[PDB]
Amino acid sequence: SYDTVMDKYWLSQYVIARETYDWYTLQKDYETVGMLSSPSEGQSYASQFQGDKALDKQYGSNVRTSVTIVSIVPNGKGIGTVRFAKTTKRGDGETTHWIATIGYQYVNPSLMSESARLTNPLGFNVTSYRVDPE
Amino acid sequence: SYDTVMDKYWLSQYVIARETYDWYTLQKDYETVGMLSSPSEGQSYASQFQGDKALDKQYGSNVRTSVTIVSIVPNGKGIGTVRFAKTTKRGDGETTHWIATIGYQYVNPSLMSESARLTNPLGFNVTSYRVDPE
């Protein structure tokens, strides 16, 4: 269905933004994840760029981790599975495989601003995020 | 309508990708514009990163131009008007205002790959692009 393609699109945008580490894309991705998730998930995600051992502090412009969406399975019940590959470099770097289990819902778009709808037109909102090894 | 919000989203993604100059976002934006437009518009856009006087050659990591979508007016007849502000820095830099008139259509999504649909789920395709001063 039409809805299924649309879910895969948002699930993909979400994973790519959350799983990517790139100094020059950092604030935009951090902001994408922020607008795309509930407060509870937002803080949880934010925790890694918080404190002193923050990733940006550690890595800076030296490390880069690119994401490759391999497959996405929406389940039509608010849960989505996303298989993807992570590639980290400072050579070919190290490529690792993972599965993100995502809890998501669409929140009434008419309750946001028009400008906010320019980035999240359908009110896509992530309620829970889980990443596991293969 | 639902369709109107969806058009504004793609029009916004398009302008932001086409009007932005950022060395570390260059290839991704160049690729976004590419998948989002017809061959004729794609080449036309590509012409500025082509040749020897190419922007990336000139600017490199020194210049940066950020985009601010101010308003978008879809017309329900394949044309969209996008007012936006351009901000260029190397200070506060120089901010200039513009209007992009966009010709666009949605092309049958079922004729693309699943992976291609992860970035252009509805087959949004730009047929003509025009930018004018205020």
Question: Which of A5, A61, A67 to probe the B interface (max B CBs under 10 A)?
Answer: A5
Q: What is the DSSP letter of A109?
A: G
Q: List the determination method.
A: X-ray
Contacts with B19 (C-beta within 8 Å, 6 or more apart), sequence order? B65, B67, B84, B86, B98, B100, B131
* Residue spans of alpha helices (H) in B77-132: 114-117
DSSP H or E run through A70? strand A64-74
Provide the domain limits for residue A127. 1-134
Greatest alpha-carbon pair distance for chain B in Å reads: 48
Give CA separation, B111 vs B1, B105, B121, in Å.
26, 15, 11
The amino acid occupying position B89 is: K
* Residue spans of alpha helices (H) in chain B: 2-19, 26-35, 39-46, 55-59, 114-117
CA distance B12 to B5: 11
DSSP H or E run through A4? helix A2-19
Structure tokens at B118: 């992860």
With beta carbons less than 8 A apart as the criterion, state whether A133 and A22 touch: no
Residues of chain A contacting residue B69, judged by C-beta atoms under 8 Å apart: 115, 118
What are B66's strand-pairing partners?
B87
CA distance B3 to A97: 37
Contacts with B90 (C-beta within 8 Å, 6 or more apart), sequence order? B62, B63, B64
Residues 104-133 of B with CB under 8 A from A: 109, 114-115, 117-119, 121-122
DSSP H or E run through A42? helix A39-46
Residues of chain B contacting residue A8, judged by C-beta atoms under 8 Å apart: 114, 117-118, 121
A25 inside 8 A of chain B by CB: yes
Contact A121 B24 (CB under 8 A): no
Q: Tell me the three state secondary structure of residue B64.
A: strand
Residue A94 phi, psi (nearest 5):
-115, 125
Output the CA torsion sign for B30, B33, B34, B38. negative
> Which CATH number goes with the domain that contains B123?
3.10.450.230
CA distance B18 to B24: 14
| Closest to A122 in 3D by CA, of A107, A102, A101, A104 | A107
Q: What is the DSSP letter of A76?
A: S
Give CA separation, B52 vs A16, B56, B58, in Å.
33, 10, 9
- The number of distinct structural domains making up chain B is 1
CA B122 to chain centre: 16
Contacts with A68 (C-beta within 8 Å, 6 or more apart), sequence order? A84, A85, A86, A87
CA distance A75 to A7: 10
Contact B22 A22 (CB under 8 A): no
- The two counts, helices (H) then strands (E), for chain A are 5, 4
CA distance A106 to B76: 25
B27 inside 8 A of chain A by CB: no
The amino acid occupying position A65 is: T
CA angle in degrees (0–180, nearest 5) for B126-B129-B130: 160
Question: Which of B9, B20, B21, B64 to probe the A interface (max A CBs under 10 A)?
Answer: B9
Structure tokens at A14: 């979400």
The amino acid occupying position B129 is: Y
A22 inside 8 A of chain B by CB: yes
